[PDB]
């Protein structure tokens, strides 16, 4: 079916440019306008502009004028937005969207700091029904994504919003499962940090 593949995150420094993409598939690329919308964390939605891929007719919201430039490449069915001389005011999630369908969004962080991959720590009990967890500590920038047993374990899962301490992000996730099924059967934490292109798996071993 229809989908709009965006990249997960991008870190860049102040003053620098950046180019965000939105690969489309499942439909005729040229038959639907592509929108771009900006959402700041905790905050609300702001419309940036839109582009007709057939002939590249382009509208902008005037608030994003000169800041934002739209293009496409028919050859690859991809839509682009080009942002010039960045600032922390531009740090946000950037969604591409078409009639009826929104992309997953790219988290853009504008900061002079280094990409810092997370350290991942298992949370097992010290000793019916058991709670395990994962501590994802010391990363930058947002976001991280957590799954359990590559998505097979999704029931009774709680993943918490990240906290920011000393310019680094921390978060954790809990999973509750039958004592029957652990440690009898494997349980594993899966953590993605797309800004550093990092993946980490942690097997929860008993303590």
């Amino acid at each position: 079916q229809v989908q709009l593949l965006e990249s997960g995150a991008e870190l860049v420094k102040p003053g620098a440019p950046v180019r965000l993409s939105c690969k489309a598939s499942g439909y005729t690329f040229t038959n639907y306008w592509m929108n771009w919308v900006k959402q700041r964390p905790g905050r609300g939605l702001e419309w940036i502009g839109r582009i007709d891929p057939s002939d590249s007719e382009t509208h902008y919201n005037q608030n994003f004028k000169d800041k934002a430039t739209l293009t496409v490449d028919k050859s690859s069915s991809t839509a682009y937005i080009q942002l010039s001389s960045l600032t922390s005011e531009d740090s946000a999630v950037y969604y591409c969207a078409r009639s009826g369908y929104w992309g997953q969004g790219t988290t853009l962080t504008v900061s002079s700091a280094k990409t810092t991959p997370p350290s991942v720590y298992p949370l097992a009990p010290g000793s019916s029904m058991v709670t395990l967890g994962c501590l994802v500590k010391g990363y930058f920038p947002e976001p991280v994504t957590v799954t359990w047993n590559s998505g097979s374990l999704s029931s009774g899962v709680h993943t918490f919003p990240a906290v920011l301490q000393s310019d680094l992000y921390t978060l954790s996730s809990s999973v509750t499962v039958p004592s029957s099924t652990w440690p009898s059967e494997t349980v594993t934490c899966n953590v993605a940090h797309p800004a550093s292109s990092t993946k980490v798996d942690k097997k929860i071993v008993p303590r």
Binding site: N35, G44, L45, E46, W47, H59, N61, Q62, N63, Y95, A97, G100, Y101, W102, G103, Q104, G105, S119, Y121, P122, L123, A124, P125, G126, T131, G133, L135, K137, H158, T159, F160, P161, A162, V163, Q165, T170, L171, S172, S174, T176, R207
Partner: protein
């Protein structure tokens, strides 16, 4: 630029009871073409937005039959026959009649349910983490209702509040409860110089703190 106003900000409802969100525009949304380009949208926590309604009243296919939309000119409402846990999220109205497109600020939807006490779990530092010179003691307070809660930490019976970081979830998409994380961070040296670590919760389901703990 055209201005969208949603009310209420937060809507709280008994299961099975019906829900209504009101959307107001600073200017009529009837386009010159006879169509009214008013849309509704849903964003569940951590999720990408999902179309609910377009053209005031036309319901996205893929969206359950309890959602309806109506209104005209500057006044519009979204109705839900009876609310379920899967409806919880933030509801935006947005307009495509006049450029630039503008959005309402959002209405957060909430469900009432029976009181539930937190399942509390405590976890000492990871061995891996200790090696590298840090120590984090973790506490989960899961599947409780109502929202209102708070956590106290104790090392060897004395309260500790420096180095504590908490995080909360929004209502659960199946059971309508809330869950919370609390994390206490120390140096390895400090951690090792004490024995008794206690995590304890204050909630209306209990007259006393609900306590979990461990010793080294």
């Amino acid at each position: 630029e055209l201005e969208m106003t949603q009310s209420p900000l937060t809507l709280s409802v008994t299961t099975g009871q019906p829900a209504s969100i009101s959307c107001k525009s600073s200017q009529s949304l009837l386009d010159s073409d006879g169509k009214t380009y008013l849309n509704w949208l849903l964003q569940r926590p951590g999720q990408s937005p999902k179309r609910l309604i377009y053209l005031v009243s036309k319901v996205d296919s893929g969206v359950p039959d309890r959602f309806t939309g109506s209104g005209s000119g500057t006044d519009f409402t979204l109705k839900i026959s009876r609310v379920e846990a899967e409806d919880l999220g933030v509801y935006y109205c947005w307009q495509g009649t006049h450029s630039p497109l503008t959005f309402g600020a959002g209405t957060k939807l909430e469900l009432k349910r029976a009181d539930a006490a937190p399942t509390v779990s405590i976890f000492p530092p990871s061995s891996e983490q200790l090696t590298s010179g840090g120590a984090s003691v973790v506490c989960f307070l899961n599947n409780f209702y109502p929202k209102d809660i708070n956590v106290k930490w104790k090392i060897d019976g004395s309260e500790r509040q420096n180095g504590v970081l908490n995080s909360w979830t929004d209502q659960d998409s199946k059971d309508s409860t809330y869950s919370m994380s609390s994390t206490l961070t120390l140096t390895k040296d400090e951690y090792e110089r004490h024995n008794s670590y206690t995590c304890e919760a204050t909630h209306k389901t209990s007259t006393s703190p609900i306590v979990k703990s461990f010793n080294r």
